[PDB]
Design a protein around this ligand. Structure first.
Ligand SMILES: [Co+3]
Ligand SMILES: [Co+3]
Ligand SMILES: [Co+3]
Ligand SMILES: [Co+3]
Lengths: 217, 120, 156, 152, 216, 120, 152, 217, 119, 151, 216, 119
């Protein structure tokens, strides 16, 4: 039941290793690093910024420096020790406000802040999302169940170069006295991309269909 | 016969990061935060990372993000030249003719290397 | 019922296949049949899709395939070890593959094909070595010697 | 402006090159028709609600003199009992078939169907319709004019 | 001269020659069409805003209410039995702070012609007919209209013999306005539901206009 | 050759209107306002005015609009049978799987002849 | 040969990927219809002689029991005066429209048109036809057989 | 399972009978008639014409009258007593000669001389055959394995009105002294259509793929 | 509306089609041997005179029979009957690319009188 | 002319040939069959045996740019920039299915000549882009344009 | 000027600027190409028809035989190692009463340029490349050429380094003809295989000629 | 990275291609007259052994020359050289529909040793 993709994957990996381009160890190391990734660090960065005005300022001006606060050093955390080859080392945090709301996309591919947020959603990589968001953001966001006042500036950020973004949504009402953990808990991956906003009681991305893999990880 | 320098990038960026490793290599920036610029419609045969939807449009520079070789050069193994990259904000109405006035404050922010910019 | 609604949605999607059109097959037309507009369109960089009209679709998540993770790790390791930079990968992977493969094949299928491609283009392996390896891999599947974590060897 | 116009023309042209698995149909055998295809082929063309489509900048359109005349003809034919609006809709928005339904203009279908009812209910023979068309073209080609469409 | 114009002349001459309808009938119908427009519907709305008793009639019996603005669905048309295509069952859909209506005919272009005039080119489009019923919020946003998420957006699909006009809620900033002033801001688009009346706005939103080869 | 009665409709509807001319011909309505009904997926070969998107969905009858022959019969010159028509309101969530809960109150109202209705 | 079988399957599959400039038609305005297109859209579907086509390995096909029953029904309807063969050809090979004409099977069109004449000449109401179809489906479901198409 | 086609066929047949359009007996009577049809009569007509110069003249000038000689009366053989509704009553026989070779098609449909030849081939009804024969007969015939001298007149007959045709091929070499039955035996259905010529020892149409029916007769 | 289901049988029983229309077209406008060009009459809704023959010139080789045109018969109009002719066309006159190597190839088909005009 | 309209008609109706048109938008791996995988990963230039229609073959005058392009490609090979086999692989295969059949024969030769200059780093993509701008300005400024346009 | 001409100059000037090749090299190659034609090939066939010994050499060693007509596949081109694209392995396919050849390059347009000149536009067409190898009888018939069914039609696909020219059989009606006269009827099309030589025919069969935008 | 732009000219001048590779393939694995079947080797990225020949059996009629496989030459790898063979295929073995009437038709093309296996 082996597919042509799996056949080719083995061929490529074995050949690269035989020719000494990289070792079997390097490959396992990268996979291990990927397994350590997730959206929690980014969520905690937001919670911390909500609770600390000074840190929020740092997040806005220097995302790379701010990321260190949640244990994610864009330069030294990845195995390379020079940032991941594909995500680079220039994270920027986009702070929403009562008059500004951000949403992110990579129209050219799937550019995502993997080091601090984890792997990108399947739909984020879709030609559809990459075609539509930059031109009809209000409509796409509405499909995701998010609507903002017409006077609010919706800003779409297209990650087309070496910068990667995470969205710092506005802190919702009904979270007075909440701890850092309680706040971070409602800042889902979708909130960090910008297709959703944090809501008390909602601690998981909105449920959507899940396409099963032939041979899942 | 051809030999590829597989250690160059690592030796240059280890402990520093990319694009941090290109800091200061672009020299003086041609534009500054607040300047209004129009995106030049340079030829994009084979490769470009400056979206077609931005060509000819005018926007405002809101930040000098970093220095780095242009993707047009890096993608073909040419890193000898480094230039400034700018984060530019466009009004949605200036990109899409049909954008509704009801949503007059909507914008789009993206990054473009200096070579594509010209005074507005 | 659920079966009724299921058939309704299946219908709504199938009729799209029958959407009428003026379909003009292209077979190496003469230069005089290529307008400036067509020239610019054919020489476009495939990955630049922002702003193109598209329909609404119910976005879904997708489980990661073992081979996709392995492909991703391979591409980053090749970059990590200097075979290429991510930018060289993007140009080869999202543009050089051409329009048809770009939208016809899966996301990670392109990542994988391009990883195979860099090995040959930079002459780290000959195309012959690649072709022989693929045959070797298929023989493993057949011979029942299994292949990595994709299929174990013949049992009892 | 000039660049923006080229940009938008480009965004529209690339749509023509959207890759696809294009399967021409040439009267396939019954065994090649699944239940899904059967239902799709025997569908009523006018029932499009819910089908996925793209965003388009809606436009208004001036009414053609022939469109106004066609509309009046269709309502007058109904007024005088040649047909009811429902019979018209069935013939006009469904009987024309998928290809003509989306390939021809809105009022083109209204007009073709007005001609159709005259023949289907035998008020005029197809021969009479064909001969009238020949006469009309000759009238135009000779230079004697064609009503309000072309002066002599 | 286009093939459409040739065919139109042929069909009309044959119909008249065969006595299916008269030259007079055809002229009379075109004259009736020319008298149509959005003014009577706009007036019905303004009148409803200023007269609660009338508003109640509009909501329960649109046909009867239409008479007050000079449009008798049965006798205004030349047939004396209503237009063959629009029929005689107008219903007025009243918006409220929690309910906003928008109309479409997914099967065709069904429109309340007697009281509203001719349908917009876009209203007849397969695009509008495919999308409005499924993604109304998105389509309306394209028209520049957005409503609170809790408000019930109701799409009305005119698929049988009923035709609809939308009675929008009266907007703020119209204190002491006369019937004429209020009617002035109730445009065709407001009556279809793709726009809401706003003081100072007395014409449909500007959109590209595709020119006809030989316009009326 | 067949003869078509071109005066029947006018004689029946003049001074009365359509569908007013069919009033009282359907008899006792099978359903009443407030009733919950499911749309039967009847064959639609050649013609139907009950959209595919409504098949199998359940809605609420909000009005008995009028009496009239079904379009399926009228479109083929058959007006001998008259039945009640009902205006039905569907929740958008019951028609479209992807509809957002954020817009939970959105609905769709359309008319359907009695033949397509069954008690929910 | 399994290899040859894959070779031929390949040669057939690549045809699906033949590049093209694909322009979907969505009720264009009258001004977008040239005389050439007007003639192409109003053509009678059955007139295909001279159209370019590829070489295909012609095959014979066994007759389906329903195809034989369909043929007999069409000839019996003509025999008993419901229609003449010419009326059938016009409705069957032309009125069905371009899409169904090449998308459905030869005898599928014969059958659809036999159902069509019953309704068009009012020997059966569309309601009766729809009801009958429901009956046939219920007959199959309930396990009550279906002529020689399925024992009860 | 029963297909959508079988469901509709049954519905149509029962409605027609119920409405008195035609009877159950008529339907059975017609199927029985079809069952009696085949290429034998037409083959005999050719064999007879080859052995009787006077009969050949009749065939060429009056196909309907000649047909009676082989037991097929185009007017009274069918159950109608006025010819079959679709095949009509005007059979014409096309006689090949050393300088003339005919091949038939119905570009508008599938028009075929059913009464004397039986049912048409699947390929004969194909849009492909209907499109190509009239324009590239040489190439299409070559595909069938038939080639003729470039100076021989290839005539394509398009059966577009009420006439139906059968091809009378030239008598092949090596048939000296053959009886009527022997000669008729090599005149296959394909020879009568014109895509093949009779050959001694060949008593069946060239073998070609056969698409199986879901529920065959 | 009543459709006469006995008319055709009453007209053709024991006679046949197109035999039943004999003598109803009157005098033929053309004769065997005449050169005729095919008129490009409107095809709207129906026609049995193939597009590939329009404007081409051929030779009448036979007056096959009399019958109402298919354009009328297909819509239930059989009041008028006309002559049908079998016409032979040279392949090179139909197809611009036909090879001179096969200069004798032809195509024969039938066309009702209404489509014919003196060459 | 009637015949001209006839032949124009026959070619036009081809545009309306019915089909089951399935647009592809980056399908998931589970939607790719072995047959499709082999088809997508095919080498574009291998068309022998594919069904096609009869067409009236024609000759074509050579464009001056085509003559120059051919000379450039052969001269690049003559001087060791590449071998003809490397050209073929890049020109008739690497270009991809769409460009392969959508663009002109010599259009692919020319694109590939520009391609080798960049791929082997004899010129940077930036130099190529700048040159193109120069040629367009040269044509606009009316400064002439070789044998393609006088000053 | 077209986009092709814009890019052609860019590429040529760039290549020369970077010293990949000189302006002189370019002029030299165009000159060489300008001298190419089908005459040498025609003369080779003519000589073979009159000299059985030469014919044997043609069939066994095309490269050697080519020298007799002034075309040295190795030294004639400016490179001194053959043209980069045509290589140096010409083979001559000799037709016989029971064998007739026709050539094609299904992968591209591979043609024996040194001895025959430039390939025909149709030879480079995807259509010719797709159909010839599978339906040769049909394609040849379209060209007006038909051969006995027993005769072996052999299609040669030039997919590697060998280039072919077809040596057709000497036609009837040429008794007593000189080499010069015989050469005149061996056209480019005869050397490809889509036509056979015929007395009095000294040019390829006339066919449509698509004009270029800017020829020379 | 530097490219040796003089290599080819230096070894091919005054000799030619593929003459410059003569003798570098060693002893041929097959000879004229041998029956061989075409192996369906992976085509990823490039190949000059047409798909229509895969799995078919033919007859070697000539050892045309020695040269690096196109699969290698096209990517700058000329280190290995092998024998090229001209193979003749019966048309009926390539195309299932080929008519028996033309039973002598054939197709000849060249294939490097790597794709050949004794039939
Ligand atoms: Co990306
Ligand atoms: Co409507
Ligand atoms: Co027929
Ligand atoms: Co080639």
């Amino acid at each position: 039941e082996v597919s042509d993709f799996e056949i080719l994957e083995m061929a490529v990996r074995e050949l690269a290793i035989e020719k000494g381009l990289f070792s079997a160890e390097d490959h396992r190391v990268w996979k291990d690093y990927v397994h350590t990734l997730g959206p929690l660090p980014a969520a905690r960065l937001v919670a911390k910024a909500w609770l600390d005005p000074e840190y929020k300022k740092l997040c806005i001006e220097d995302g790379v420096e701010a990321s260190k606060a949640v244990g994610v050093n864009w330069v030294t955390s990845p195995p390379t020790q020079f940032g991941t080859p594909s995500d680079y080392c220039n994270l920027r945090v986009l702070a929403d406000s009562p008059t500004l709301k951000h949403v992110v996309v990579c129209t050219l591919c799937s550019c995502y802040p993997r080091p601090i947020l984890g792997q990108s959603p399947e739909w984020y990589r879709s030609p559809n999302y990459r075609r539509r968001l930059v031109r009809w953001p209000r409509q796409v966001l509405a499909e995701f169940g998010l609507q903002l006042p017409s006077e609010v500036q919706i800003r779409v950020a297209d990650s087309n170069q070496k910068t990667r973004y995470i969205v710092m949504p506005v802190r919702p009402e009904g979270t007075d006295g909440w701890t850092e953990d309680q706040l971070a808990e409602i800042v889902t991956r979708d909130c960090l991309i910008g297709v959703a906003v944090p809501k008390p009681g909602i601690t998981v991305n909105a449920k959507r269909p899940v396409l099963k893999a032939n041979r899942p990880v | 016969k051809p030999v590829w320098d597989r250690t160059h990038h690592a030796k240059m960026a280890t402990g520093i990061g990319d694009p941090q490793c290109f800091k200061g290599m672009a020299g003086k920036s041609k534009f500054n935060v607040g300047d209004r610029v129009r995106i030049k419609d340079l030829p994009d045969l084979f490769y470009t990372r400056t979206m077609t939807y931005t060509r000819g449009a005018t926007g405002t520079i809101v930040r000098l993000v970093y220095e780095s070789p242009a993707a047009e050069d890096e993608a073909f193994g040419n890193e000898e030249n480094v230039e400034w990259f700018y984060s530019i904000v466009f009004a949605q109405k200036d990109l899409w003719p049909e954008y509704s006035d009801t949503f007059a404050n909507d914008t789009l922010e993206t990054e473009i290397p200096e070579r594509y910019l010209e005074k507005a | 019922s659920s079966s009724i609604r299921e058939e309704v949605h299946r219908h709504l999607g199938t009729v799209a296949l029958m959407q009428p059109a003026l379909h003009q097959q292209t077979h190496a037309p003469a230069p005089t049949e290529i307008t400036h507009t067509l020239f610019r369109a054919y020489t476009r960089v495939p990955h630049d899709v922002g702003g193109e009209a598209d329909v609404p679709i119910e976005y879904h998540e997708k489980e990661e395939e073992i081979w996709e993770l392995n492909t991703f790790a391979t591409c980053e390791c090749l970059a990590w070890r200097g075979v290429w930079t991510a930018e060289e990968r993007r140009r080869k992977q999202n543009c050089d593959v051409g329009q048809t493969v770009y939208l016809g094949m899966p996301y990670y299928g392109r990542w994988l094909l391009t990883a195979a491609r860099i090995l040959v283009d930079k002459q780290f392996v000959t195309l012959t070595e690649l072709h022989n390896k693929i045959v070797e891999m298929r023989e493993r599947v057949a011979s029942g010697q299994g292949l990595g974590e994709y299929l174990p060897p013949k049992a009892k």
